[PDB]
Design a protein around this ligand. Structure first.
Ligand SMILES: Nc1ncnc2c1ncn2[C@H]1C[C@H](O)[C@@H](COP(=O)(O)OP(=O)(O)OP(=O)(O)O)O1
Ligand SMILES: [Mg+2]
Ligand SMILES: [Mg+2]
Ligand SMILES: [Mg+2]
Length: 378
DNA sequence: GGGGTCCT
DNA sequence: AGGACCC
C-alpha cells in the first residue's frame, strides 16, 4: 500500500503573522526578535542580508530600515498555527503537527477517491501542480506517478485555501513518506510546492550534505556517527549494520539506516488537541530560594491563562530545571481543580523544587519551567 | 535558547 | 524521570 503524504511549511511564520496583523508592515522589511536575537524575518529583509538567528545589532547595522517586533509572547502565533491545522483537517482528518508552522497530511485515502471518480477517458492531461523534483519526466502510465500528481493538486488546493481564508503563504512537498515529503518541501521556497517521483528518491537523499540534515538524525545521533567516521549519507548507507546496532542499539540503528536510503514507514499521527502546556524561562542568575519563587509564580501566572481557555483540566503538574534538565512531578489534588488557586500550587511546586534541589545550600541553574500535562478526558 | 512530541 | 527528536 504505497502512500501519498504532504508536508506543509509556512514561510517565515512569525513574520507572516505579524504582517497579517499590522498591514503597515507589508511595505516595510520586518524581523521577529526573542531575547537579543532575530528568530525569523520576512523575505524582504533576508535580501538586505539579514540571516535568521543573527544578533539584533548586526541586524540593525546590516539593515537600518528594519522594523523589529517582539515574538516572545507566542500567543498570536499559536492561534494562527491551529487555524492552519484546522483548515487542513477539513481536507483530511489525519493531520500531524510539527512545531507551529509545519503540518503533515495523509492524502492516501483522499487520492483514492478522486481517482475512482475519474472516467477512464479523462485520464489526461491530469497535469502536475508546481515543480517536479529534479525535473523528472512524468510517466502517465505509472499508477505511482499518477497518485502523486493528484497529491500535487490537493496540495495546490490546500495552499490556495490557506492564502484565501487565512492570508498565509507556504510550501508543500508531496512524497511517498513523511521523510521524503519534508525533504522535498523546501526544495523551492518561498511559496512554492514540489512533488517527488520515486526514481528521484536517491537523488534527493544524496543532495544532502551533513548527515544531521535528515529528519530524525539529530545532535546526539550525529556525533555518535561522526566518531564512527560516518559523515556522508552514503557513508551511513554503506556502514556495517552490525557495528551500528552495537554502537547505537538495535532500535535506533535499524530506523536511521532506513532513513539514509529514504525509507520511512512511520504513519502520520493525528495530533488532536495539545497534551501539555508549558512556559520556559532561562536566565543569567538564580541563587537564593526565593527568586525561584518569583519565577515559578510568573510562569504559573502565564500558564494558568491558557489553561482557563483550553477547557479540559490538567491532572498532573511538573517542575523542570537545567542545572549547574531534571524534573519532578505529582498529581494536582482534587480541590485545586477549580480554575487564590495560586498559593496552593506554588506550595506544591516549591515542595517539588525543594525535594529536587537543596535550598540550604547554593545551587544556581539557568532554567526554570512549569508544565501542565495529563488532561482529561483522555 | 521556545515549545512540544514519542520511546525507554 | 530521563533521553531522544522536531520547530
Ligand atoms: N533557532 C531558532 N530560535 C528560535 N525560533 C526559531 C528558530 N528557528 C526557527 N524558529 C521559529 C521561527 C519560525 O517562524 C519557525 C519556523 O522556522 P524555520 O523552519 O527555520 O523556517 P522559518 O519559518 O523561519 O522561515 P523559512 O522556512 O522561510 O526559512 O520557528
Ligand atoms: Mg519549519
Ligand atoms: Mg518555515
Ligand atoms: Mg536533523
Amino acid at each position: 500500500s504505497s502512500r501519498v503524504i504532504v508536508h506543509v511549511d509556512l514561510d517565515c511564520f512569525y513574520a507572516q503573522v505579524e504582517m497579517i496583523s499590522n498591514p503597515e508592515l507589508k511595505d516595510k522589511p520586518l524581523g521577529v526578535q526573542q531575547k537579543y536575537l532575530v528568530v525569523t524575518c520576512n523575505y524582504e529583509a533576508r535580501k538586505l542580508g539579514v540571516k535568521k538567528l543573527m544578533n539584533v545589532r548586526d541586524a540593525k547595522e546590516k539593515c537600518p530600515q528594519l522594523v523589529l517586533v517582539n515574538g516572545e509572547d507566542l500567543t498570536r502565533y499559536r492561534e494562527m498555527s491551529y487555524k492552519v491545522t484546522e483548515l487542513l483537517e477539513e481536507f483530511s482528518p489525519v493531520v500531524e503537527r510539527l512545531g507551529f508552522d509545519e503540518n503533515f497530511v495523509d492524502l492516501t485515502e483522499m487520492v483514492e477517491k478522486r481517482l475512482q471518480q475519474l472516467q477512464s477517458d479523462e485520464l489526461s492531461a491530469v497535469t502536475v501542480s508546481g515543480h517536479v523534483y529534479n525535473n523528472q519526466s512524468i510517466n502517465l502510465l505509472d499508477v505511482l506517478h499518477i497518485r502523486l500528481l493528484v497529491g500535487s493538486q490537493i496540495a495546490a488546493e490546500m495552499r490556495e485555501a490557506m492564502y484565501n481564508q487565512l492570508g498565509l503563504t507556504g510550501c508543500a512537498g508531496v512524497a511517498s513518506n513523511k521523510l521524503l515529503a519534508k525533504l522535498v518541501s523546501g526544495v523551492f521556497k518561498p511559496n512554492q510546492q514540489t512533488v517527488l517521483l520515486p526514481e528521484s528518491c536517491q537523488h534527493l537523499i544524496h543532495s544532502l550534505n551533513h548527515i544531521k540534515e535528515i529528519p530524525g538524525i539529530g545532535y546526539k545521533t550525529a556525533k555518535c556517527l561522526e566518531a564512527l567516521g560516518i559523515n556522508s549519507v552514503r557513508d551511513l548507507q554503506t556502514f556495517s549494520p552490525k557495528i551500528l546496532e552495537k554502537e547505537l542499539g538495535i532500535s535506533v540503528a535499524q530506523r536511521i539506516q532506513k532513513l539514509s536510503f529514504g525509507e520511512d514507514n512511520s504513519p502520520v499521527i493525528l495530533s488532536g488537541p495539545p497534551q501539555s502546556f508549558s512556559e520556559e524561562d532561562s536566565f543569567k542568575k538564580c541563587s537564593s530560594e526565593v527568586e525561584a519563587k518569583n519565577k515559578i509564580e510568573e510562569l504559573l501566572a502565564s500558564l494558568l491563562n491558557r489553561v482557563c481557555q483550553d477547557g479540559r483540566k490538567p491532572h498532573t503538574v511538573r517542575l523542570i530545571i537545567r542545572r549547574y534538565r531534571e524534573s519532578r512531578q505529582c498529581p494536582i489534588p482534587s480541590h485545586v481543580i477549580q480554575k487564590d488557586v495560586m498559593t496552593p500550587m506554588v506550595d506544591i511546586l516549591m515542595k517539588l523544587f525543594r525535594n529536587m534541589v537543596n535550598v540550604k545550600m547554593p545551587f544556581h541553574l539557568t532554567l526554570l519551567s512549569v508544565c501542565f500535562c495529563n488532561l482529561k478526558a483522555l
